[PDB]
Amino acid sequence: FCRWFQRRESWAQSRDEQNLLQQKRIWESPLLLAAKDNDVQALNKLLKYEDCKVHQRGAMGETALHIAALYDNLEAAMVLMEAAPELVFEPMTSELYEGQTALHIAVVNQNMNLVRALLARRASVSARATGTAFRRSPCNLIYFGEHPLSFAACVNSEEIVRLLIEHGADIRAQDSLGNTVLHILILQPNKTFACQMYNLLLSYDRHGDHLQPLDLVPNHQGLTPFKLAGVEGNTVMFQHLMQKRKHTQWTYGPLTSTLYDLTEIDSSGDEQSLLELIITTKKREARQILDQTPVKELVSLKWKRYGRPYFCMLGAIYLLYIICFTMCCIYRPLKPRTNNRTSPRDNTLLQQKLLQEAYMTPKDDIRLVGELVTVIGAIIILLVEVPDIFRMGVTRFFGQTILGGPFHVLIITYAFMVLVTMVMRLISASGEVVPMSFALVLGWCNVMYFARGFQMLGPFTIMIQKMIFGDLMRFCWLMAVVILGFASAFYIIFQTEDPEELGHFYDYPMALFSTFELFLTIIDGPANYNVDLPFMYSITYAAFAIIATLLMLNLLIAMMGDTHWRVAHERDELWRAQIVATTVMLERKLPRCLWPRSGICGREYGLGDRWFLRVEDRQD
Amino acid sequence: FCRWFQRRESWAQSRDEQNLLQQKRIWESPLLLAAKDNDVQALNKLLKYEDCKVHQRGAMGETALHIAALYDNLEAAMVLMEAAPELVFEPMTSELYEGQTALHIAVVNQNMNLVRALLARRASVSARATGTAFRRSPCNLIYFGEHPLSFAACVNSEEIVRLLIEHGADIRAQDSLGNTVLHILILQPNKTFACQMYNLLLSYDRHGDHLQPLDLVPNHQGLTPFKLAGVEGNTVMFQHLMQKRKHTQWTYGPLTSTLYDLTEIDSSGDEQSLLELIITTKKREARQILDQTPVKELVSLKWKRYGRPYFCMLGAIYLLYIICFTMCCIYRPLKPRTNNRTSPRDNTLLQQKLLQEAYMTPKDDIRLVGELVTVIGAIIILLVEVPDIFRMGVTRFFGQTILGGPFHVLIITYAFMVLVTMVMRLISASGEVVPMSFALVLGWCNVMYFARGFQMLGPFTIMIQKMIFGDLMRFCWLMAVVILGFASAFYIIFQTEDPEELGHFYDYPMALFSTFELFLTIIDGPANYNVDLPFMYSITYAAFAIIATLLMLNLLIAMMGDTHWRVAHERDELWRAQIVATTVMLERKLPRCLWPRSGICGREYGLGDRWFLRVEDRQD
């Protein structure tokens, strides 16, 4: 141990030391045991002392009022405020617990009548309990904000909440995150009780401050509560929050006619829309928000009327881009050999050694125009996604990768080799086959990026990705463990052996190439049938055949059959997740002369400047 | 039949003969029928006789009191104790039933009032009914110990249990196994009723004997009851037994703060810990104990902070050990042939016949140091596990094998060949390829022993083991049945045939090697296309192809697909069973300068010398 860095996490161990030492500070001091209990008979003596430390601190800086607030002794705490009036005017002062007063803690007890007596002792509710135990993180179980009625918001006690409001509680105060009361209601674990908490707290603003008047306010990172429920995936309240958002028109027996506001769902301007905030997460449960009556009908209108024409024609032109690129790359200039087959005895079989800048003929001019287009088209790829990563971060760019498929890397990786294949053409380098070789195969792989606009072959592409980054990768870290052994084991066998017959391997690098082919059974297999092989070979070849082909190959095809039925229900909305992610990027990049806006605008219908959308259906 | 040994088990047949003969002893003697029933009117005559044998024995040695204790005739048994006061002072005296008094048997009747009248007749409870029908084994349905209130413990009758205690019942008496009352409560089949039996029996000790005062006592093999529930897998009571073990600190609304004792869970010293006793069994249900709130959080702390660094670096060095071993074994010294290709006409193709102790050159010195390391490192393997089997038994060593994987054998089997490859190098033997051949391949197989510290490829290794010892082994005992037939059947066909064409087999041993390759379809297949083959061959080759490749191969890949979904839920805790078994051995072998101890020690916190651990969570 000499170079440990960022691999301790001893702060969680440190607060545990803060836990037990604080209990020792309880145990040594006598009056804190009387603060741990009622102990009212001895407590009458404790305040009738000379030097009873009424303002002393714990290990994290409590008082007896703080401990009585913990162990909810309402009778004993009545004695505390008698000779110590200043005692209510002190919060917690530790790094872990900063700003927490006893008025906060009785709210955490969530069934108290001391809170009346505490506010009878002029207790301010203007505290900000912003200790490090109160920040949202995967190391605390709660996240309650900074404020007393905000703390009361998370515990569902209408008797206390209304009693907080009637003593001057500013409801529209915010936290260090910029989040107010209403933001914290969304992130609660119990989705049930917050709806009554939301509906009751609506009734107390009624205020002339028309500036974002009670809930239209974002945080420092610009997140509004109606949009926040889509972020954290509130299935329950988003239906409930849509009620004042939805406006109805008329009904017809079992039929109705409604209208949607839509004004903070579609991308109006350059602002972060709701739809953009859907796919920009790793949270799983927020993706099934797309099965709601305002949501998918916007999606299943504009892709039906605009996307499928725009996707296929964009799909069509990319198909044209590669075939002419295939046309030129199969027609490369070529001469025969010049250097007379000099050095290797029967170990060369190439005879061409390709041409140079001597190029001018009335046939290459077709190829000259042909390879001219694919260079300039490759620049176009480097003018639409290269400007993205100047502002879409690095990890923020890779955040899109796993959700929507890793195609955005490979399309630049296509054009990256296209830069090479004209430079080395220009300077007349030796290796032209190798940079074209990736360049030919990486283009046709990007055709499956357009295998998304059809239901019949769309979702099949997804579980390919779920096995390349999934079960094939875990298979590779055992397959290589098998083949690195047997190949070296095979190599010593025919080491003492002439390679003119059974030249399946004669040297160690080709041996690994051979034994890998023995693993996948894509080759023939060694047999000479004229000379008996060495005595070890017949043992080791068959044993390799059993545990790899009969066992390990057929095991690998079995484990993927386990995958499909337990990913079958989820892949349908993944296919829906393809469309919307395709929709927003296609909508945002393409200009205003194209793409008429969704919905129906106002400005002629007496309904504002906004944009409405309807639906009608049988209620049955 | 002349040499039968240990293949009878006629003792179970023998006790059945003891059953029916005892019923005949009932049937012949007249008063035992009156002991089989009430028969009180004739029973008034039976004791008013001259030579009524009041102390006689059955076939296994009953009395009429014993039979009345069986057929629970409380009215008739009142007559028995009148003229026979000594009759209560006799237990059963057979080999099968030894030490069983009638006071025991009325407790087995579990709803009696004769037990008051029996103890009114000064019946001792100091009996030890240790007959061979009372030993724990897979040949009796119960195991109740030796004592009356111990017998009453298994029947849940608080009216009788308290009546046993108030007549001088030593609760802390033990059996021949060293097990007391409380041990027998754990091994009961009904997990429900014992909790009330445990909680009630706690209240009667209260005694000044601080020596293991009521339940801290082990048996002769050193097993304490709190540890015994982990041994026999009591899911129910281990949560219940943790209540006085767990100590709480404080709560916070829906949040709490507790603390665990832990003092008989982690390996404190050289004693048999709880965690050691988990994996040292074949019992299945005891392995799901690891899903409890004191248990896995110890596991999911110290492997997260210490194991994964220690496992990977141990995983790293073994990867270095084999590549230099690969480096030397591919660079063996070699000369060309000397003996002029003398004996076989075109049946040798080797031309090297490797070198001897003529070795000194400034290139082999690198290999000399290279093979020096792998010899000494092989000794290190034989210094850590060779000392284990001096005290970890033979079958006790193989008891670890099936649970954690059969890698402990193969790692010595690795170094076993490493001893050979330097001796035969020293004495210049002929065969160097063959002992290296196992030695190269057996090392790389042990790399998958380090394919356990990752979730992505860890559990995939387990069902490999569940098919090598599982479905491939049952496939081998039919595959060999197929291929031993057809190969001999094939051999006579091309027996009357020249081997210069279609030399797939020309002799019987190579034929089995060929037909095995025909089974797995890893070779090409016989075709000459110039001479018609014999008339039998076209029939027998295709029929072999159907029932093996089309039928038997594809059947074998189908039956393993049946396995995965019905082993899918269980393999997750098997992967957890990997970690803890890795944890204890890594912890015990590595010394005190490494591995800071788990939990938080006392000695400064007013809580003893012990070691505490906490958790905090939402109760919700």
Ligand SMILES: Cc1cccc([C@H]2C=C[C@@H](N3CCN(Cc4ccc(=O)[nH]c4)CC3)CC2)c1
């Ligand atoms: C993942 C995993 C976990 C545990 C074990 C294994 C397997 C690893 C190597 C296997 N052996 C089998 C074949 N053997 C050659 C042989 C030896 C004698 C013979 O008569 N025929 C063939 C060489 C290596 C054993 C088991 C894999």
Ligand SMILES: Cc1cccc([C@H]2C=C[C@@H](N3CCN(Cc4ccc(=O)[nH]c4)CC3)CC2)c1
């Ligand atoms: C496990 C098990 C249980 C019960 C039965 C079997 C099979 C065993 C041998 C099988 N036969 C089928 C093929 N037959 C050659 C043939 C004969 C006539 C023909 O027209 N074509 C091909 C040779 C042996 C029959 C069934 C296996």
Ligand SMILES: Cc1cccc([C@H]2C=C[C@@H](N3CCN(Cc4ccc(=O)[nH]c4)CC3)CC2)c1
């Ligand atoms: C190519 C291939 C190789 C191996 C296996 C398979 C298929 C055969 C078993 C199937 N599994 C999953 C479905 N399951 C049905 C079921 C039964 C009860 C229930 O409550 N729900 C669902 C039955 C077992 C799926 C996979 C295919």
